[PDB]
Amino acid sequence: STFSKLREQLGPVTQEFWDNLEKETEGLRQEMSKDLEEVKAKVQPYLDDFQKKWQEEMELYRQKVEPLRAELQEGARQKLHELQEKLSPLGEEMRDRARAHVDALRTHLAPYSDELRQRLAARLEALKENGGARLAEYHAKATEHLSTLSEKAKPALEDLRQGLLPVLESFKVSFLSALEEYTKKLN
C-alpha cells in the first residue's frame, strides 16, 4: 500500500504545474474565440440585409401565383364532377347485382351443406365408437409400462448418494482449509 501513498504525493506536485501551463493556453484560446465572436457580429447585419431582400422577392411571387393557383383548382374540380356522375349508375347497379348473387349463393348452398355435414357427423360417430373400444385397453397398458421403471429409480439413486458422501466429506474439509490460505495471500 506504500506505492499508493507515493503516487498520491508525486501527482499533486506536477498537477499544479500542468494546471498553470493549461491556464495560459486557456487565455490564448479565449483571445482567439473573442476575435471570432467579433467577426460573427460584424458580418451579422450583412447577411441579415440580404435575407430581407430574398424574403420579399419570394413573397411577391406568392402573390402572383395565388390567382393562377386558384383557377387551376377550379379547372380540375369541374372535371371529376362530370366523371363521377358518369360512372355512378353502372357502379351502383353492378354492386346490387353482386350483392343479390351472394345471398342466392349462400341460400343455394345451404341445403347441400346441411345434408353433407349431417352425413359426415354420423360417419365420424361410427369411427369414434370403434376407436374408443381399443383406446381404453391401450391406456391401461400405458401406466403399467411407465410405473415399472420409476419404482426402481428412487431407491437406486438414493443408494448412490450415500456412497459418494463418505469421500466427498473429506474433500470438502480439505478445500475449506486451502480456501482460507488462499485469501491470506491475496489480502
Ligand X SMILES: CCCCCCCC/C=C\CCCCCCCC(=O)OC[C@H](COP(=O)(O)OCC[N+](C)(C)C)OC(=O)CC
Ligand Y SMILES: CCCCCCCC/C=C\CCCCCCCC(=O)OC[C@H](COP(=O)(O)OC[C@H](N)C(=O)O)OC(=O)CCCCCCC/C=C\CCCCCCCC
Alpha-carbon distance of 166 to 164, in angstroms, equals 6
Considering only residues 20 to 49 of the shown chain, the ones binding ligand X according to CB under 6 A are 33-34, 36-37, 47
Q: How far is the CB of 36 from its own copies (least distance, A)?
A: 6
User: Judging by beta carbons within 10 Å of its beta carbon (0-12, 13-18, 19+), is residue 4 exposed, middle or buried?
Assistant: exposed
Alpha-carbon distance of 75 to 50, in angstroms, equals 38
Alpha-carbon distance of 35 to 32, in angstroms, equals 5
Please identify, among the stretches 16-24, 57-65, 101-109, 123-131, the one whose residues bind ligand Y according to the rule CB under 6 A. 16-24
Q: Please, where are the H alpha helices in the chain?
A: 2-42, 44-86, 89-151, 154-186
Type of residue at 33: S
30 scored as a contact of ligand Y (CB under 6 A)? no
Type of residue at 3: F
92 scored as a contact of ligand Y (CB under 6 A)? no
Please identify, among the stretches 17-25, 97-105, 128-136, 176-184, the one whose residues bind ligand Y according to the rule CB under 6 A. 17-25
Contact residues toward ligand X (CB under 6 A) are 11, 14-15, 33-34, 36-37, 47, 51, 55, 58, 61-62, 65-66, 69-70, 73, 76-77, 79-81, 84, 87-88, 90-91, 94-95, 98-99, 113-114, 117, 135, 138-139, 141-143, 145-147, 149-150, 153, 164, 168, 178-180, 182-183
